[PDB]
Amino acid sequence: PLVNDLRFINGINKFIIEDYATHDFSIGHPLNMPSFIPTATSPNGCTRIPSFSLGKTHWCYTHNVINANCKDHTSSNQYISMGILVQTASGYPMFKTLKIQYLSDGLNRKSCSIATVPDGCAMYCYVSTQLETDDYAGSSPPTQKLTLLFYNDTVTERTISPTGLEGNWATLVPGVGSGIYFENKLIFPAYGGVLPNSTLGVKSAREFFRPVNPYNPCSGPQQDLDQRALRSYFPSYFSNRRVQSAFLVCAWNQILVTNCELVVPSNNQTLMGAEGRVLLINNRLLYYQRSTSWWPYELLYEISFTFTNSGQSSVNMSWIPIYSFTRPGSGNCSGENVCPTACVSGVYLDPWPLTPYSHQSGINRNFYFTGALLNSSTTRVNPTLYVSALNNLKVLAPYGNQGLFASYTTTTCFQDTGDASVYCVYIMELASNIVGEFQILPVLTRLTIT
Amino acid sequence: PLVNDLRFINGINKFIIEDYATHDFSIGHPLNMPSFIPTATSPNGCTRIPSFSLGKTHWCYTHNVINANCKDHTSSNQYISMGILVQTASGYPMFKTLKIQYLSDGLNRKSCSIATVPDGCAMYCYVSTQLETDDYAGSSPPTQKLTLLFYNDTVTERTISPTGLEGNWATLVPGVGSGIYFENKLIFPAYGGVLPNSTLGVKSAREFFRPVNPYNPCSGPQQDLDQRALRSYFPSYFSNRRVQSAFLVCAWNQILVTNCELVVPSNNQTLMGAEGRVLLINNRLLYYQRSTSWWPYELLYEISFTFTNSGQSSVNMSWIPIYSFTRPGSGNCSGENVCPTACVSGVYLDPWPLTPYSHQSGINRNFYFTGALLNSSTTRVNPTLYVSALNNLKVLAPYGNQGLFASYTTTTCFQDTGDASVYCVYIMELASNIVGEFQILPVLTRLTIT
Ligand SMILES: *[C@@H]1O[C@H](CO)[C@@H](O)[C@H](O)[C@H]1NC(C)=O
Ligand SMILES: *[C@@H]1O[C@H](CO)[C@@H](O)[C@H](O)[C@H]1NC(C)=O
Ligand SMILES: *[C@@H]1O[C@H](CO)[C@@H](O)[C@H](O)[C@H]1NC(C)=O
Ligand SMILES: *[C@@H]1O[C@H](CO)[C@@H](O)[C@H](O)[C@H]1NC(C)=O
Ligand SMILES: *[C@@H]1O[C@H](CO)[C@@H](O)[C@H](O)[C@H]1NC(C)=O
Ligand SMILES: *[C@@H]1O[C@H](CO)[C@@H](O)[C@H](O)[C@H]1NC(C)=O
Ligand SMILES: *[C@@H]1O[C@H](CO)[C@@H](O)[C@H](O)[C@H]1NC(C)=O
Ligand SMILES: *[C@@H]1O[C@H](CO)[C@@H](O)[C@H](O)[C@H]1NC(C)=O
């Protein structure tokens, strides 16, 4: 059957530290097991863009595979798998793949996000026929695909046209990070270009968000910095479309006929649209946003939805004030730049919150989160495991030596309810000498909390 | 179901070239797919000793996983998987894993051989409680395990005591290379120390085999060379036991109760016991023998069995006169040594024969075989794809750069009966920069024959 070992079922999607108090951390050494993420079989062949979700009863995973250089965007296939957590005599769990689906039909599916659903996985993709710049330049969104893969080997794929898409968007793609299934709703992260002359475009004009780091502020007048912040949403690279984050929401009951819906947040509460991830921990929803724009720090929002079933659903998000480490970027978009400017940059590194931020009682200043960063302000290099507080890093554990190239990282933590052990899996694209561009490595460590 | 794509089912375990004529070869570039061989999840974690068998309807694979240094032997686990060949839109087949079994119970199972059996896999292991030298030093063999893993998730393990083992052997271990299922018989390669002064030890005394390379002869008297060759079977490293190759044969009908049997070849026809592989091509059995002893060249025998009701079973083998390339070795056991000496050396690299040697009409001097070698006479380094004739190499396709460390290689070829394509999979242990000693890489190549 498709179900995790019982010791983990109650330790998944929970806040591991409910203390609200201060803690110290130690990141254990990598635990060896068979990797559930397949590598490339050729030296020049590409495998990239991981998406992972650990659900209560099982996990889903996917990434993109290309028989040529990563610079070759003509053709690709999609590796999808689903499995369970199993305890080993080695003393720690292992990810056991129950079902594999390799999609190679000649259809080019890109930027795919995966989600754990009852008895299987759901994947949100778009079909890539052209360059991303050509995409943003056009007036017509690419083909959006929703596929359901079940443990009984049934696989069903549909083209979708969510409410709010037609006419309002130049392009839309999935945000690569996992989505979730909650309250009979399938919710995926998404982003894309918005036509400034459309209804949404004119409604969302004047909307902007300008984060300020109290310990590292940007010098300038409020109005000018605000104008620059507003102008940062319209990169000329993307043909000055309004680059916007959105959520694809689909009714699971109607999931076969539904065509879903597009829920767009106010840009007063969020930065320029980018790749992201949707999390459900306890009963509360959070949203990670990659920092593609000028803001170098880690973007995590507490989000909540209002569902109207009449095509007018809203989303509200509250930014969690995190300034600790910085993501690598190029030019004036690098990790050292705290000031508003038009930027297409950054890298995908999502965190895992170990603590709630806002609770019924109040706000937790002792908020902690863990993940894998890249140690540099410029280059994607030196992958490093970390636990971080709001203003600073609690602990660091580099993987490999200096000069090791790495790109995307996605982290998930869970607890063994048997022995109370806390495990974190850090999935990262790492540069390998013998395989192709990026062996995607699921490193599993035990986390010590005092 | 557990069954290969129909285009491969009649192209497996066949002689690809029945021509008996001369041919030229070209080795294609590696074809990218998701690797069906899992890597280590830690930089120091060990994954070694691959065993692979492609059967008509499906394939079986296994390797050893250690949570510690490869040199540290206390605990290990065994990754086992079974799957099918599936064509992809990329234009080539891919290995799709259907069933996975990770044996981690704390039992230390090593040197495991796998075999494709009806609706599953069979694995032959021994339990390692001590050093190999202590093993050969002892008067009693370690525990022999036979485990059956089926697609229906049934797993059954037994301790076996084959007829002829007790009292005749210091130790016995599986030969690491895949075994086969043929004519209701389960056959595994094996090797180990034989007690001198035992029944078998006394009967097999005075038995020796001395291959001679006509193009690189060893100077000396025949009697002295014969005495040295005879003495090469008794390395002091193994406490002067007679190191002997054997075959584990088990009746499949009785496979639950059988206790099997041990069939030992005359040492007049074979070199010092070592790791090996049993192949069934057409209706003819072949045996690869690793060159652990003084003879540096590739050892492949044509073999045939005579079965009897009560332990009187025998085996006859004929050495295929191959001298082309050489395996790396240390000291006086290196690739440059053609002369008889007591040697424990070499490395496991098995060939896949593309042509029959002896047939009903006569003997084929145009014999060709393919595989992966290590280009050096001393160090295990520079993995290289090759096609070879009897006396010389036909073609060479290096994998990776110079100085790349590699150890074990196992090669299997099959034909696509749809488009006539010939595919070779070269499975080799390669040194990875980010993963523990030896990422085991299944390289798939299209072979061009003219
Ligand atoms: C597979 O599962 C889905 C939902 O779990 C179900 O609706 C579908 O009918 C199943 N497919 C088959 C062939 O039974
Ligand atoms: C966003 O802020 C602007 C002022 O900066 C305000 O005019 C607008 O109403 C706000 N929109 C939302 C949805 O909060
Ligand atoms: C929406 O989030 C904002 C923070 O950005 C918060 O101040 C506000 O209370 C939320 N709105 C509602 C209706 O809860
Ligand atoms: C980055 O590397 C340097 C060593 O070169 C180290 O001192 C520093 O702490 C690292 N920074 C992070 C965030 O890991
Ligand atoms: C699984 O398959 C094997 C194949 O012979 C069979 O002997 C065994 O009884 C099967 N087990 C179950 C539970 O069906
Ligand atoms: C093996 O060869 C030796 C001579 O070297 C001979 O005396 C012995 O009888 C042979 N044994 C067999 C089984 O052929
Ligand atoms: C056994 O093999 C040898 C070649 O090594 C051959 O000369 C001999 O005739 C064979 N004997 C039988 C019974 O096949
Ligand atoms: C080994 O490498 C050398 C060059 O370093 C090359 O010339 C030679 O042909 C190679 N030998 C084999 C057997 O591949």
| Neighbouring C-beta atoms of residue B343, cutoff 10 Å | 24
Number of separate helices (H) and strands (E) present in chain A:
4, 25
CB-CB under 8 Å, A102 with B94: yes
Name chain A contacts of B436, Cβ cutoff 8 Å: 32
Q: According to DSSP H, which parts of B57-98 are helical?
A: none
The closest CB to that of B34, out of A43, A65, A89, belongs to A65
d(CA B448, CA B94): 19
Tokens standing for B273?
Answer: 């016991």
| C-alpha dist (Å) from residue B265 to A273, B207, B282, B308, B317 | 71, 10, 22, 15, 8
Determine how β-strand B406-415 pairs with β-strand B349-350. Answer: parallel
Say which residue the tokens 């969510």 belong to: A162
Name chain B contacts of A435, Cβ cutoff 8 Å: 432, 439, 441
Tokens standing for A180?
Answer: 């979730």
**Which residue's CA is minimally distant from atom 9 of ligand 2?**
A207
- Nearest CA-CA partner of A58 in A121, A108, A14: A121
Q: Are A191 and A276 in contact (CB under 8 A)?
A: yes
Mutate which: A35, A399, A443, vs B, most B CBs within 10 A: A35
For chain A, what are the domain ranges?
1-450
Q: Are B121 and B76 in contact (CB under 8 A)?
A: no
Tokens standing for B286?
Answer: 């072949």
CB-CB under 8 Å, B29 with A42: yes
Q: Are B294 and B233 in contact (CB under 8 A)?
A: no
Residue B152 Cβ < 6 Å to ligand 7: no
* Cβ neighbourhood burial of B424 (10 Å; 0-12, 13-18, 19+): buried
CB-CB under 8 Å, A88 with B77: yes
CB within 8 Å of B203: residues ≥ 6 apart: none
Q: Are B379 and B413 in contact (CB under 8 A)?
A: no
**Which residue's CA is minimally distant from atom 3 of ligand 2?**
A207
- Nearest CA-CA partner of A338 in A234, A208, A223, A216: A216
Q: Which residues are bridge partners to B156 per DSSP? A: B148
d(CA B375, CA A23): 54
CB-CB under 8 Å, B33 with A41: yes
Element (H, E) at B391: none
Q: According to DSSP H, which parts of B236-285 are helical?
A: none
CB-CB under 8 Å, B436 with A433: no
SS3 of residue A225 by DSSP = helix
Q: Per-residue b/e over A129-150, b at no fewer than 16 CB within 10 Å?
A: eeebeebbbeeebbebbbbbbb
Cα-trace Rg, chain A: 21
Q: Are A217 and A179 in contact (CB under 8 A)?
A: no
Say which residue the tokens 């479309």 belong to: A241
d(CA B336, CA B327): 9
Q: Where are the beta strands (DSSP E) in A333-421?
A: 352-353, 369-374, 383-388, 393-398, 406-415
| C-alpha dist (Å) from residue A371 to A150, A349, A427 | 30, 8, 9
Q: Are A315 and A303 in contact (CB under 8 A)?
A: yes
Q: Are A329 and A378 in contact (CB under 8 A)?
A: yes
Cα–chain center distance at A5: 26
DSSP annotation of A400 reads S
d(CA A141, CA A143): 7
The closest CB to that of B96, out of A30, A94, A100, belongs to A100
| C-alpha dist (Å) from residue A375 to A315, A334, A384, B182 | 34, 12, 7, 57
The closest CB to that of B443, out of A41, A77, A100, belongs to A41
SS3 of residue B439 by DSSP = strand
DSSP annotation of A218 reads P
- Nearest CA-CA partner of B172 in B251, B231, B237, B244: B244
**Technique used by the depositors:** X-ray
Tokens standing for A142?
Answer: 């690419």
Q: How far, in Å, from the CA of A268 to the mean position of ligand 2?
A: 6
Q: Are B118 and B152 in contact (CB under 8 A)?
A: no
Out of A396, A399, A402, A426, give the residue to mutate to test ligand 4, the one with the largest number of ligand atoms within 8 Å of its CB. A396
Phi/psi-derived region of residue A63, left when phi > 0, alpha when psi is between -120 and 50, beta in every other case: beta
Element (H, E) at B345: none
What torsion, rounded to 10 degrees, do the Cα atoms A342, A344, A345, A347 define? 130
d(CA A131, CA A95): 36
Name chain B contacts of A33, Cβ cutoff 8 Å: 40-41, 65, 67, 102
d(CA A63, CA A81): 9
Say which residue the tokens 């059956």 belong to: B148
Residue A308 Cβ < 6 Å to ligand 1: no
Tokens standing for B110?
Answer: 């090593």
d(CA B95, CA B230): 44
Out of B99, B152, B153, B256, give the residue to mutate to test ligand 5, the one with the largest number of ligand atoms within 8 Å of its CB. B152
Nearest-ligand number for the alpha carbon of B318: 7
Q: Which CATH class is domain B1-450?
A: mainly beta
Cα-trace Rg, chain B: 21
